[PDB]
Amino acid sequence: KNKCVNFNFNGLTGTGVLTESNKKFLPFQQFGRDIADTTDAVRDPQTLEILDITPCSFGGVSVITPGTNTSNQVAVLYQDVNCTEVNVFQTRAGCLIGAEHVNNSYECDIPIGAGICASYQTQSIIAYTMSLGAENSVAYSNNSIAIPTNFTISVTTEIL
Amino acid sequence: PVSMTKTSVDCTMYICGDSTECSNLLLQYGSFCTQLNRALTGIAVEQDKNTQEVFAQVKQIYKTPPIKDFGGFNFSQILPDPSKPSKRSFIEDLLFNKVTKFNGLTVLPPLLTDEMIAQYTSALLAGTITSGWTFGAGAALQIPFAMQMAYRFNGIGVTQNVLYENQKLIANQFNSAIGKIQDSLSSTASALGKLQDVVNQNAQALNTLVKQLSSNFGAISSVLNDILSRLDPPEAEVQIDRLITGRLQSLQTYVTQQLIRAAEIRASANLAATKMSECVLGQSKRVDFCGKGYHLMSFPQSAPHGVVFLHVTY
Amino acid sequence: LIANQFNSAIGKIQDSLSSTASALGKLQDVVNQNAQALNTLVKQLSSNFGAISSVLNDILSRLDPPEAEVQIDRLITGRLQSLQTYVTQQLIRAAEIRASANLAATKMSECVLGQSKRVDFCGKGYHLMSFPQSAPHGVVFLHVTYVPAQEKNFTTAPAICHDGKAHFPREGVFVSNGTHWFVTQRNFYEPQIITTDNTFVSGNCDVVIGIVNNTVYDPLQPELDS
Ligand SMILES: *[C@@H]1O[C@H](CO)[C@@H](O[C@@H]2O[C@H](CO)[C@@H](O)[C@H](O)[C@H]2NC(C)=O)[C@H](O)[C@H]1NC(C)=O
Ligand SMILES: *[C@@H]1O[C@H](CO)[C@@H](O[C@@H]2O[C@H](CO)[C@@H](O)[C@H](O)[C@H]2NC(C)=O)[C@H](O)[C@H]1NC(C)=O
Ligand SMILES: *[C@@H]1O[C@H](CO)[C@@H](O[C@@H]2O[C@H](CO)[C@@H](O)[C@H](O)[C@H]2NC(C)=O)[C@H](O)[C@H]1NC(C)=O
Ligand SMILES: *[C@@H]1O[C@H](CO)[C@@H](O[C@@H]2O[C@H](CO)[C@@H](O)[C@H](O)[C@H]2NC(C)=O)[C@H](O)[C@H]1NC(C)=O
Ligand SMILES: *[C@@H]1O[C@H](CO)[C@@H](O[C@@H]2O[C@H](CO)[C@@H](O)[C@H](O)[C@H]2NC(C)=O)[C@H](O)[C@H]1NC(C)=O
Ligand SMILES: *[C@@H]1O[C@H](CO)[C@@H](O)[C@H](O)[C@H]1NC(C)=O
Ligand SMILES: *[C@@H]1O[C@H](CO)[C@@H](O)[C@H](O)[C@H]1NC(C)=O
Ligand SMILES: *[C@@H]1O[C@H](CO)[C@@H](O)[C@H](O)[C@H]1NC(C)=O
Ligand SMILES: *[C@@H]1O[C@H](CO)[C@@H](O)[C@H](O)[C@H]1NC(C)=O
Ligand SMILES: *[C@@H]1O[C@H](CO)[C@@H](O)[C@H](O)[C@H]1NC(C)=O
Ligand SMILES: *[C@@H]1O[C@H](CO)[C@@H](O)[C@H](O)[C@H]1NC(C)=O
């Protein structure tokens, strides 16, 4: 139990983590399935024990890299996996390795996701909560107005 | 609706469930798998861009002053409650309440968190209330709210004096209307149907994808492990090929529908971004672009996978 | 000054484009997407799809018609599917481009051929005029806008009380430097002495909230005295 194993119950192959289950199987019920109709519980043949089958932890691997031009140093994100299952920082995106978490917030450079962005800075890859922008309190008053005394003609480029 | 759930399907896992025999056969089908992954990734990135387009339209994170002397107009309901964990307004909370894997398909979290979207909407509203339309154009220039409203009245064609003389009445009518908004959202869920529909469509599509795994497609067993355990590799290959053909087709169907669906969402997001600019950041003279009536101002509220605009009209 | 500011800004446009390539990313992306799709299409010809050989000539060179047909069928099924995938993605991609083209046409009409009051539609600022430049598989718009540069705090009043009558500005806003009240237009500071021609009179002082007391000059009175 509690290990990723290749199990075989009565010629039923599968790979999963077997755990003691709390499911209320009725005496006749051989094995349990799911919402999706996926087998997720078994009654042991040699023992009257119900075992929940959890698929072995899998996740996508994303490599956070500043250009190779810039640096060959890389950070790896293991998506939706706990860090135990694998500069190690746990984000809502997944387990981030190779990046130093920094408190200071910066504009998002490389989006790791869930509000966390990475960049290459003085060097090492760093992970930070992205800043939305410079906080400003407008000088609002019931009798105060701000009128521009000058102007700037500005040309900006839109590409379609 | 501004965005969808970013969804990623590893086809080599979906099609063949950690089976090598199957994976080798899948190779013969070419780069079909890579192309599917690429398509879905494109959609996911587009979703993040959609949200940025609508919400991040504000130069700075403007904050409303502690003294809310807005000439009797009351915005407490649409302005955030700091007391709450996420700094969301009362109306945003109602909206959030209203709206309601192991097979290789996972959900990627959106780049901006709900709290960040709420901060962006708070910045927009603070800019709108304190500085009028000036924050869109440049540096937010403070103007008293009752005088800002008078300019907006000049915009629709009514003289400034009308607002000043009827200021108390207009403020009361405004406050009352916001009250009614609260009531409508609390009373009926149907109001957020557009958002719900988007959620439901994505859920149905994924449910269908998962169910298609149970289809045999003419193989002896839908379970890939059963085929391998019962048959020798030469014989198994034929049955596995049928499963592969069926599963790959099922996933192509899914990806294509999602591409089409994403395009529909992107159009809505583009519209939401255009309304954020011409309606929240300005006063639209376009008819019915910003609510039925003569548009005065409008206030954005974050909603799950969407934006809600409260259009004040005359 | 405006001409200089304009000329300077065009100078900066040249510099930006000359320096950084990333600026034309949207156009490049379109090119890249179409190239990847075609590259994929060509590579799928190398896929066997379960046939003995991906090469069609090899199949018929090695096998007699009855057997060859089976192998060819697999290749056909695979290749036809590959091409259907390509065409479908292209249809979807074309529709995305058509949307952009419609937007470019709309901006051509409302931004170059006119002056847009739609906000942000023609660039961040108050749109003045815009100029189109052809680009590969695209268009580039140089949006000239007006942005207020420098600003100053002034105390303001909705109206002024003269002789128990309330004066509101015809166009403009009342401002006070601290001692004297003037009427300026909202977008640029040009204070003018508050006069009957700068203001219209509606009602009385009592109903208006925030009304201040300032003399309203009548131009006619001196002329009568003279
Ligand atoms: C409005 O801003 C312009 C700059 O855009 C100011 O012009 C500058 O004036 C100073 C003082 O003579 C010079 O040193 C700069 O060379 C000028 N710049 C340009 C581009 O001409 C102008 O003086 C400003 N006016 C106000 C109201 O301050
Ligand atoms: C704006 O209106 C709201 C809604 O009536 C007021 O909020 C209420 O405040 C009182 C205390 O003054 C409480 O008893 C209510 O429970 C509050 N209601 C809600 C739902 O927030 C708000 O105080 C008013 N603000 C102004 C400026 O008058
Ligand atoms: C014009 O505006 C509204 C339209 O419904 C009404 O305003 C009411 O006026 C009465 C009497 O002054 C008040 O007691 C109510 O509180 C107001 N109601 C609202 C909706 O705010 C009324 O029909 C008209 N009022 C005037 C001032 O002409
Ligand atoms: C605000 O501007 C007004 C108008 O320029 C100023 O009033 C003038 O003050 C100067 C210097 O004392 C006099 O020479 C003028 O005769 C005044 N003009 C008027 C219209 O009476 C006023 O002093 C300025 N106040 C501040 C705070 O700078
Ligand atoms: C604006 O001027 C009017 C008229 O002089 C002021 O009203 C007077 O206020 C004083 C003090 O309360 C009273 O003694 C007078 O009887 C009032 N006269 C009238 C006709 O009402 C008003 O207070 C002034 N307001 C400001 C801003 O100074
Ligand atoms: C053999 O079967 C009996 C069934 O009651 C069971 O008690 C016992 O544990 C089994 N032994 C093995 C080999 O597990
Ligand atoms: C790295 O980037 C710089 C700036 O774009 C460029 O000039 C240089 O050629 C690049 N070098 C490599 C290794 O590509
Ligand atoms: C990892 O597991 C621990 C212990 O159960 C839990 O507290 C934590 O929330 C988990 N984190 C992730 C990334 O799921
Ligand atoms: C960053 O924040 C954490 C608390 O979450 C703290 O342990 C650490 O000291 C901080 N970094 C500094 C102050 O360098
Ligand atoms: C206006 O006044 C407030 C309060 O004194 C100040 O913080 C703000 O910087 C002022 N703005 C300008 C443009 O002078
Ligand atoms: C503005 O608010 C102050 C208190 O902060 C109040 O005394 C004053 O009467 C108000 N003035 C206007 C312009 O209504």
Residue numbers in the entry:
A (entry chain B): 535 to 620, 641 to 676, 690 to 727
B (entry chain A): 728 to 827, 854 to 1067
C (entry chain B): 922 to 1147
What did the article's authors report about this structure?
To develop an understanding of the structural basis of nanobody binding affinity, we carried out the biophysical and structural characterization of a series of six nanobodies targeting the receptor binding domain (RBD) of SARS-CoV-2 spike protein, comprising a hit from screening a naïve nanobody library and five affinity-matured mutants derived from this parental binder; two of the mutants have been shown to be potently neutralize the virus. Recognition of the RBD by the nanobodies is dominated by CDR3 and CDR2, with CDR1 only making a few contacts. At the heart of the interaction of these nanobodies with the RBD is a salt bridge π–cation interaction involving R52 from CDR2 of the nanobody and E484 and F490 of the virus RBD. As a result of binding to this epitope, the nanobody directly competes with the binding of angiotensin-converting enzyme 2 (ACE2) and thus is neutralizing.
